[PDB]
Amino acid sequence: HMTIARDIVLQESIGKGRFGEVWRGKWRGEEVAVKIFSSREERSWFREAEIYQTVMLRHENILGFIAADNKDNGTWTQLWLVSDYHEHGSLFDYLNRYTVTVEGMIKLALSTASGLAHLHMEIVGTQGKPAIAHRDLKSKNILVKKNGTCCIADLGLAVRHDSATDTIDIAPNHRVGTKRYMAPEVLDDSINMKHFESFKRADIYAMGLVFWEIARRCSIGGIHEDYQLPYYDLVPSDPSVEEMRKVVCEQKLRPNIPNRWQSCEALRVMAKIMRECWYANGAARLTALRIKKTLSQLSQQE
16 A cells, blocks of 8 residues: 555656656656666665654655655666655746745745744654754755645755754765855854754755745736846856855855835845844854744734
8 A cells, every 4th residue: 555666657857856866757646756866876865765754754844755665677776765746846946937926925935934943843752853954955955835835855965963962863074065055154164063053054044045036036016036046146057165155255245135125024024034044153043943933923914
């Protein structure tokens, strides 16, 4: 009765992650997303399977994991990660295609903050959930569901915390994620990687960048900005750590907050959240839980 690779038929190439190619597959007539790794990418596949199997991880704003499996075609073995399929694809894809209403924007931002607060939060008890930091949050790693809410995906680079010792389950390497979204402390290598809270704080900075991407697409009276990645105005399309560091750490620039975002309460609340995610010092940033509380209060109002 469980979903297994032998019962899935691949239908369409739908992209790729850091490692592994993504396909839309069919399981008993239902669409599922399948990420395929080769035998030499076993460590990447195993780590992502391990994060997704974390006790008590499931949440409406975390990509639904189905299975980790192997499939031998008779010549070579493929290593599979099967998850829920979301037709809209990433938040990046969605924001390029559409503009959103004030309601649409709040739904996207609130669901992203809710997923991150869940990832970040330790759940104590017999079926306890460790606190987890993503390390590669970006609009391309967040998917949009049919109901217009987000779920966080691409958890392969995540780190898990053991609170009783204050130790991380792996020996993290420096600058693993997407250069454009790296926090200032990551870009200049000053981050204390023995401190789990430092990873949560770096995720918040990246979530602020994602909120900026969403707000640009919030159309009020037919007025909105065109889709852009953060720092589109300051760095090349595939920026180096050095190009990012010069902008983010040395010149201390952040994405521009348009004047038209001061003319709407929801856009003023979003812009204030962004500023409060973007401090150079991670200890000064808002927590995911505080952002969730703020956006929950704003959705209740709107």
